[PDB]
Structure 1
Amino acid sequence: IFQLKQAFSLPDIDYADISQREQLAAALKRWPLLAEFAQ
């Protein structure tokens, strides 16, 4: 919260619905960086 007041927040990210798409499961399998943030 910067002081008019400007607030700052982390980007809205939701990983709950990953396991649905099989293509996303293979991408998380190959790249450990993406799997690290996902789980």
Structure 2
Amino acid sequence: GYIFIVALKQAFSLPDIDYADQLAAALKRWPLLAEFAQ
């Protein structure tokens, strides 16, 4: 991701998301959700 006078930094990264493995019906219903899960 990205890392931002005084001795302080702030790191930025994408959120930690785990699509490792019910929800199969949710992914078939919504192509937007299936898109990120593949």
**Structure with greater strand percent:** 2
**Structure 1 moving runs of 4+ over 6 Å:** none
Structure index of larger Rg? 2
Q: C-alpha root-mean-square deviation of aligned residues, in Å?
A: 3.2
- Report how many aligned residue pairs link the two structures: 34
Q: TM-score, normalised by structure 2?
A: 0.76
Q: Percent identity over the alignment?
A: 94
Structure 1 unpaired stretches of 5+? 18-22
Q: TM-score, normalised by structure 1?
A: 0.75
Structure 2 unpaired stretches of 5+? none
**Structure with greater helix percent:** 1
